[PDB]
């Protein structure tokens, strides 16, 4: 099917306590593959998936240069944005950056992304056309003007439509055992009385890949969405994911309930009934 590559940068000012911290990670779909931490001892971009380890030194040296120059850039920008928002030099603040590309089943470019936040909020984003920018506020309008004058969009577009997509295809081919495998969820139900008259039905999905899944509860074929407790999809720690959905049911009326499980790795959706 379709695939993504995304890089996530976070830079945090720590006033008085020296240089800002910069962390970088890269993902292909829901599999992390690289990292960089300005605080760590290596001062190198590092592998975090088996299939990226085969890249030679020139790949690692270039990638390390890129994140270092980014961390330096963010260092200057943290100051600039403090200026724009009239903030004291005493607060901690945060620049976040997400960029990347998607490709289709055939490997062709689908889209590209670049979006920037300040303190957890939209700051500036590249529009889907890869030609213009959307500023969230007055401060980011100033940034936008610098980026228009500097032709930043053209530079970003050339990356997203070229290198981004080429390397994504390469990583998809070199990691095809792990990246292109679908792990279906392994399902079961749990059941606990709350009272003599009321019981929790909890529907479990485990060991699935990728993260995307849908779990729904139904009574007599009718959706129960308002009365369903759902947890966020969570990493097992081994590359796969977990999720559950629970309903509180009248003791004795369990047979009316059905959990429905949808996932890419399932030929057909599963139905579970206690």
């Amino acid at each position: 099917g379709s695939h993504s590559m995304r890089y996530f940068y976070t830079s945090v000012s720590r006033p008085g306590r020296g240089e800002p911290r910069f962390i970088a990670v890269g993902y292909v779909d829901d599999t992390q593959f690289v990292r960089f931490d300005s605080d760590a001892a290596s001062q190198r971009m590092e592998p975090r998936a088996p299939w990226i380890e085969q890249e030679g030194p020139e790949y690692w040296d270039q990638e390390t240069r890129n994140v270092k120059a980014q961390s330096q850039t963010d260092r200057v920008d943290l100051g600039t944005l403090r200026g724009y928002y009239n903030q004291s030099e005493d607060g901690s603040h945060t620049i976040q950056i997400m960029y990347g590309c998607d490709v289709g089943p055939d490997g062709r470019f689908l889209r590209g992304y670049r979006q920037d936040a300040y303190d957890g909020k939209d700051y500036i984003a590249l529009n889907e056309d890869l030609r213009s920018w959307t500023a969230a506020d007055m401060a980011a309008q100033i940034t936008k003007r610098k980026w228009e004058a500097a032709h930043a969009a053209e530079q970003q577009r050339a990356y997203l439509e070229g290198r981004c997509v080429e390397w994504l295809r390469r990583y998809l081919e070199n990691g095809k055992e792990t990246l292109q495998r679908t792990d279906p969820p392994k399902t079961h139900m749990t059941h606990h009385p709350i009272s003599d008259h009321e019981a929790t039905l909890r529907c479990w999905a485990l060991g699935f890949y990728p993260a995307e899944i849908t779990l729904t509860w139904q009574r007599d074929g009718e959706d129960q969405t308002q009365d369903t407790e759902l947890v966020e999809t969570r990493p097992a720690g081994d590359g796969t994911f977990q999720k559950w959905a629970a309903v509180v049911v009248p003791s004795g009326e369990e047979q009316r309930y059905t959990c429905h499980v949808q996932h890419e790795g399932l030929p057909k959706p599963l139905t579970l009934r206690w």
């Binding site: 890089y7 970088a24 890269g26 971009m45 990638e63 890129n66 994140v67 120059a69 980014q70 330096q72 850039t73 200057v76 920008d77 600039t80 944005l81 960029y99 940034t143 610098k146 980026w147 500097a150 930043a152 530079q155 970003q156 990356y159 997203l160 290198r163 981004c164």
Partner: peptide, 7 residues
Amino acid sequence: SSCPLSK
């Protein structure tokens, strides 16, 4: 990865 731009 991609290459920096200033704000």
